[PDB]
Design a protein around this ligand. Structure first.
Ligand SMILES: *[C@@H]1O[C@H](CO)[C@@H](O[C@H]2O[C@H](CO)[C@@H](O)[C@H](O[C@H]3O[C@H](CO)[C@@H](O)[C@H](O[C@H]4O[C@H](CO)[C@@H](O)[C@H](O)[C@@H]4O)[C@@H]3O)[C@@H]2O)[C@H](O)[C@H]1NC(C)=O
Ligand SMILES: COc1cc2ccc3c(c2cc1OC)C[C@H](N)[C@@H](c1cc(F)c(F)cc1F)O3
Ligand SMILES: COc1cc2ccc3c(c2cc1OC)C[C@H](N)[C@@H](c1cc(F)c(F)cc1F)O3
Ligand SMILES: *[C@@H]1O[C@H](CO)[C@@H](O)[C@H](O)[C@H]1NC(C)=O
Ligand SMILES: *[C@@H]1O[C@H](CO)[C@@H](O)[C@H](O)[C@H]1NC(C)=O
Lengths: 727, 727
């Protein structure tokens, strides 16, 4: 009667094999084996030992990562890694000649380097150190210093500040090489007048006085960072005179007030597109700027400026979507919310603004994965009208009726959720099936869409799981006000619909979220279902993503309303089904899910006996501007201050009398500050409500260190088991 | 009947009734009788309404406290109270002329005044504002500024810094008037090179960004603040020239290193005594200083210098004890530990180094309360060989073998714990019996020690607690290594010895602590006994006070050792008594007790099932220098770093697998910094131990606010009840 135990989750008893490859050419890619890096050919199989783990003994330092130059001559080695935020870090760097089999000692990249990157061809290097940009034409040669204004916590050249990193670019870098690698474009960020979040960091017990960390962080309605865009020619660099960065100022549409740079895409060698976004994020502008060799400057022609605005809510999913440009750069494809509010691919001519929708229907495109002369490849949730499914498609650019699903019917029962990685000029691709069956990895040729070989099919894990009492999984929908709203249920083994099980509602419910999908996972819910016989439910109600704006923009300016009501309403529908002990219905959630969980418990519905909130938002004025304001607008009397104040967890404190609550938070959360939880604890105390609590010293929003991760789930497991009266 | 519930404690259902009086003369005292301030004739009771409960009805502000001058002409009104640390605060101040029943409104005391005080006679005013001293001769007239070097968190003129406030003077003021009010003595602290503790304060929900509080706090081994002492003549204050402050420099044996000013006591109109302590607190020095009217300076004769030291530990109980000077100022009485190791009254002549012990034996003098021409009055625990008891005594100065107890037999069954307050010339005195019966307040005449009248006897409360199933106290002792160690037990009503009971150990166990005593308390323990049938015990092991240096100095340089070991042994002893359920032995504590509870739970003794630790110290290097170093010395290689490192809670993390642990701490604890608990959790998480936790937002070391107080005792009750399997 072996089951998926808590320990199995915490101690990776049942590993899940991936197949991460790195496309180096159109024909080849790299893969890790024995710790060695092996280059493969796509068509034949043609293996060859590119690099060997034996190479880097006597190097002294442990190698965290690497990066092979485009041309193939050099490899970057990344050590002394030190994590900062979600994507940001610092690390020491060294270069290895590969062809000479020699490590380079000449003019080495500085220690504590913030970011580094090769050009897309050849072997130029750009790196950021002390918030300044440096360029190295050759590894061995001295670097050319581009920026001289870098300054910790104020001026950021070629790297992002906290809020851009987190909410805009999903990256620490703010550099963009042109394709042939001659121009390097970069953004500069200025946080002078941005207020600082302050919190304690305690460190090893040997540290006597706690450190006070100070991070520039704009909260809702605060002073935001200002941005400037620059381009510099990397060929015409002088070793004698300072480099000259040409500015590309934002368009007058943006300069009237607060705005952001949101997307940067090169079209050609002489052409670059810049999407901007007003601080009120319903209005966006894309300039298409061309280099002229006459004046040495850049020109964004007004006749190529594309405006994009939404009247129901915000622009894009989390931002304006990226443009994929054609060969000549005189036209581009780009996902746009259509007339019926469903996101689809729109074909633009650069000097004709009204695009043509090459796709349509009651479904959305997730992303444009590859563009060729004749075909555009994209991922969508079209197959079987299932919003939580993902498949690869291609549309013939010369006739839009020629839509071919390349992944729908490969293993229909085993695969309904695909992601894709193409080769450099898109001749091949790798298909990643992440569920509902065991994940499956296969390589393909884009010429005739032939299944070349299976890279990894997780048959080892399959042998192991055959013996285990695994939970099943049910994906389905309910109808509310005519609309289908989907849910998923991790059901226990030997599921008996006449019996009555306790239910845990797994919640996120943030703007454009999707918890109801066909993905295969081995997580906490697996354990709860397998060992403790708990149904783990997830529901996607109003505000959720990938089903059109009808649903998604329902919460516009109204966070802590419809998405809360629907999670409550979902649980009510789960009792109706007659296999749920309605005396043992619980809720839980991390982050936004913690806010919704908190607000749900504060609603006073009585449906939920107990709830857990991990690193929850409490009041939208405590969280950052770029995220909060995209949905809530500005917290002013003239805009939406009232709902800001009306949607706090604190104000509902009285209603936690009837529930059991567990409030968990990391003390060094730089994202959802411990502040947030501090005000929840303080409100509950003031209305005399008892509740359990837990801080995690020096843990951040992830609470992901092996020890902390194990401790929190063990604590939450205990709390749920006792709430459900289980041994 | 009904029981003493947790509601009774928290809501304060059964109040005791005090009798707080201020002796204004040799034969009169003031009493606040339902806001009407009366003045009583001590000899009879002839009382007249000194000031109406009305008077200040159209003031508009709420009066926090009041202070009437010695001459009776003026009354100081305190309002806008804003608590800082244990003693410190700021307030607004308005003066009121009693003769003319009108309010002074010119040259008023500024707002945010840090301290104010009358001269001991007349109506002069010294006050502190922005860390600078001011003097007003007349309430209406402009103040004179004394100090100009005051600077927030750097220089403190006339007021203590953090550490002196908490660890030396138990007061915010560092201002001492001469008896007639001619000279104003003042200390000055320089916290420049003293590091800062920093922590978040989140404040009202409205506050968008938390405030980092930054307090000068020297942790163990850090840079201490320096001190300088001065005197100034208030009678000769010039409004043209800035005032002259004559400095009294510390003795040379102090100036060779770090040191503290630990006592200031005026002996006569022109004579002031100082006491200095080395940073290594086993060496004190007293200088008696006389005014020289010809040069206008202060000289302390090396003839009148008195060295006070120790080989077994540290000087005095918490600091060098205060001297009570004779009228002429040519001698004084002072509590000192003797040959045997017991603290008794020694008689010093100011110009002779050796004193004579006027009392002796295996008991200790707690304090010297009065001095007349032929009798010295003192409180001690000599009666019935009970360290926990307190009684008033007098000793004939012409014959030390004639010793009369004043309070011993007044009511032996009811009263074993007295304090006293004498009239201006010890003609009358108020005796205050704190237990074991209900507290009793009586007035007496020192001429013959005649009882005059019962002032308060708590009859009202006596009638209330007849319909309440009250517990019963049991003060007793066990023997360890042939030495008696006292303990108490709060026992549930209907105490059946043949049954077995759950045991909670209330612990403090700090140096010179006393938890086993004769006082009557209506506290949390009263509810655990009366309602839940829990035996709540406390035990004064090694390190405990009022039983000699054999016991109190047993933990010198060795905190975390015996006082821990002894609480365990005490629990082993109680489990061997037949009426104690050894399956259900709990332990708890606040502060030092929290440190001890933690050390005990991580001891691996296997005696305690569960325990609660509240605002615990975790590592002595985190706690302040003045306290910690008294009992540990410096945390250095040359001194005692080895034990500083050996005596952490975190070193004992592994052993918490055997116990249910609740850790509690407030986020604005300026004293034992949240850090300390933060380091415990991290250790428990690092080794994978489960434990419950609870933080209290913006609460300090007291966790005293109405709602925070109610919530923690509520929270701790559940923890104990469920640990003991009680409904
Ligand atoms: C990042 O952003 C910073 C502002 O957010 C910017 O710093 C400028 O702004 C600061 C405000 O923080 C200004 O103090 C300063 O400009 C002004 O400085 C003086 C005020 O203290 C003011 O007297 C100056 O005006 C004078 O001089 C100018 C010509 O230089 C004349 O126009 C005026 O008539 C007058 O004579 C001046 O206006 C800062 O420049 C940072 O520079 C920015 N960093 C970037 C973009 O890298
Ligand atoms: C598609 O790209 C994105 C998806 C995203 C999905 C969730 C998402 C973000 C995303 C940011 C993205 O790009 C910058 C950023 C938020 N800080 C994050 C987030 C949201 C919260 F409400 C919260 F309390 C903490 C968080 F870390 O949620
Ligand atoms: C006799 O007077 C005193 C008694 C005292 C009794 C306990 C006492 C103090 C005292 C200070 C005194 O005067 C300076 C000061 C300490 N900071 C306090 C104290 C000790 C601790 F171990 C701790 F963790 C927190 C504290 F606030 O304990
Ligand atoms: C370039 O500009 C910076 C401005 O900070 C200056 O300090 C540096 O000397 C200049 N170098 C050259 C080569 O002009
Ligand atoms: C306080 O100390 C510093 C050196 O630590 C000194 O420079 C400063 O002048 C001092 N101030 C006073 C008022 O003593």
């Amino acid at each position: 009667r072996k089951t998926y135990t808590l320990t199995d989750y915490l101690k990776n008893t049942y590993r899940l094999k991936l197949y991460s490859l790195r496309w180096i050419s159109d024909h080849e890619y790299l893969y890790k084996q024995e710790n060695n890096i092996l280059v493969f050919n796509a068509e034949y199989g043609n293996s060859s030992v590119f690099l060997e783990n034996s190479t880097f003994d006597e190097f002294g330092h442990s190698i965290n990562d690497y990066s092979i130059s485009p041309d193939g001559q050099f490899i970057l080695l990344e050590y002394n890694y030190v994590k900062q935020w979600r994507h940001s870090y610092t690390a020491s760097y060294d270069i290895y000649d590969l062809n000479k089999r020699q490590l380079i000692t000449e003019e080495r990249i500085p220690n504590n380097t913030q970011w580094v990157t090769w050009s897309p061809v050849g072997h130029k290097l750009a790196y950021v150190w002390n918030n300044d940009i440096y360029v190295k034409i050759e590894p061995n040669l001295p670097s050319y210093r581009i920026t001289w204004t870098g300054k910790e916590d104020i001026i950021y050249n070629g790297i992002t500040d906290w809020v851009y990193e987190e909410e805009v670019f999903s990256a620490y870098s703010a550099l963009w090489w042109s394709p042939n690698g001659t121009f390097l474009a970069y953004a500069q960020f200025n946080d002078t007048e941005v207020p600082l979040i302050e919190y304690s960091f305690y460190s090893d017990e040997s540290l006597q006085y706690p450190k006070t960390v100070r991070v520039p962080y704009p909260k809702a309605g605060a002073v935001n960072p200002t941005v400037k865009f620059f381009v510099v020619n990397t060929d015409s660099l002088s070793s004698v005179t300072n480099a000259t960065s040409i500015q590309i100022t934002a368009p007058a549409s943006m300069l009237i007030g607060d705005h952001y740079l949101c997307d940067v895409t090169w079209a050609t060698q002489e052409r670059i597109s810049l999407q901007w976004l007003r601080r009120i994020q319903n209005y966006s502008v894309m300039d298409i700027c061309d280099y002229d060799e006459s004046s040495g400057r850049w020109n964004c022609l007004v006749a190529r400026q594309h405006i994009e605005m939404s009247t129901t809510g915000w622009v894009g999913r989390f931002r304006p979507s990226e443009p994929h440009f054609t060969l000549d750069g005189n036209s581009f494809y780009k996902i746009i919310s259509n007339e019926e509010g469903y996101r689809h691919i729109c074909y633009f001519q650069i000097d004709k603004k009204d695009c043509t929708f090459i796709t349509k229907g009651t479904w959305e495109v997730i992303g444009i994965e590859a563009l060729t002369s004749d075909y555009l490849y994209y991922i969508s949730n079209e197959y079987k009208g299932m919003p939580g499914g993902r498949n690869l498609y291609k549309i013939q650019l010369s006739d839009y009726t020629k839509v071919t699903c390349l992944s729908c019917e490969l293993n229909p029962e085993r695969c309904q959720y695909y992601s894709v990685s193409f080769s450099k000029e898109a001749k091949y691709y790798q298909l990643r099936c992440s569920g509902p069956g065991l994940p499956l990895y296969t390589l393909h040729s884009s010429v005739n869409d032939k299944g070349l070989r299976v890279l990894e099919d997780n048959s080892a894990l399959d042998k192991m799981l055959q013996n285990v009492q695994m939970p099943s999984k049910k994906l389905d929908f309910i109808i509310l006000n005519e609309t289908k709203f989907w849910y998923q249920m991790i059901l226990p083994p030997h599921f008996d619909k006449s019996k009555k099980y306790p239910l845990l509602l797994d919640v996120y419910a943030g703007p454009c979220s999707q918890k109801a999908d066909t993905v295969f996972r081995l997580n906490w819910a697996t354990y709860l279902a397998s060992t403790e016989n708990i149904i783990v439910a997830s529901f996607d109600g109003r505000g959720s993503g990938y089903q059109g704006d009808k649903i998604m923009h329902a919460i516009n300016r109204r966070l802590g309303t419809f998405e809360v009501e629907d999670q409550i309403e979902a649980a009510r529908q789960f009792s109706k089904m007659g296999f749920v002990d309605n005396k043992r219905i619980a809720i839980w959630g991390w982050s936004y899910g913690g806010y919704v969980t908190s607000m749900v418990l504060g609603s006073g519905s009585g449906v939920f006996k107990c709830g857990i909130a991990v690193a929850p938002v409490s009041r939208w004025e405590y969280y950052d501007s770029v995220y909060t304001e995209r949905y809530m607008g500005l917290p002013t009397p003239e805009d939406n201050l009232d709902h800001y104040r009306n949607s706090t967890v604190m104000s509902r404190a009285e209603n936690f009398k009837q529930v059991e609550y567990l409030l968990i938070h990391g003390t060094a959360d730089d994202n959802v500050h411990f502040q947030q939880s501090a005000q929840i604890s303080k409100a509950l105390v003031d209305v005399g409500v008892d509740f359990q609590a837990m801080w995690y010293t020096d843990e951040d929003h992830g609470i992901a260190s092996s020890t902390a991760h194990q401790h929190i789930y063990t604590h939450m497991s205990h709390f749920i088991k006792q709430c459900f009266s289980l041994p």
